[PDB]
Design a protein around this ligand. Structure first.
Ligand code: CL
Ligand code: CL
Ligand code: CL
Length: 145
């Protein structure tokens, strides 16, 4: 298993690692999160999904910037403000911009159709452009389209 590139981002007290990697099952991007409380979690993306994710990020950013401060005091019961879904064979990815007490974050959940092993990262909304730009330049180099 070879590591082709890494990007590290510090966002509102968390860290994120974006690693481009390669093994006999192909090339992919691993995204690892270190929580504000220390909690570790990871998701894995094919390069085609990472390009699709990168495009969604521009759109989630415009939405985020249009919001202004909270509240008023009326959120949707589940907490979700904007949603997308990405598909890669048997893998599904839910992108939900949520708003809780601590603030705004893009929750990204990876599931497998059947299903099976699930996992998520929670990207503070202030970091969406940094994450987007980090994806864009890993993809310039490693993802041909
Ligand atoms: Cl930040
Ligand atoms: Cl694998
Ligand atoms: Cl799959």
């Amino acid at each position: 298993e070879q590591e082709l590139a890494t990007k590290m981002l510090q966002i509102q007290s968390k860290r994120f690692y974006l690693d481009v990697k390669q093994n006999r099952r192909g090339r992919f991007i691993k995204v690892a999160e270190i929580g504000a409380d220390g909690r570790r979690s990871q998701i894995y993306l094919a390069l085609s999904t990472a390009a699709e994710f990168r495009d969604h990020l521009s759109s989630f950013s415009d939405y985020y910037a249009s919001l202004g401060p909270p509240n008023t005091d009326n959120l949707p019961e589940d907490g979700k403000l904007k949603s997308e879904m990405m598909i890669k064979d048997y893998r599904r990815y839910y992108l939900d911009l949520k708003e809780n007490a601590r603030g705004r974050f893009l929750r990204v959940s990876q599931t497998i159709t059947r299903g099976g092993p699930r996992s998520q990262i929670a990207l503070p909304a202030q970091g969406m452009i940094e994450f987007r730009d980090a994806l864009t330049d890993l993809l310039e180099e490693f993802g041909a389209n």
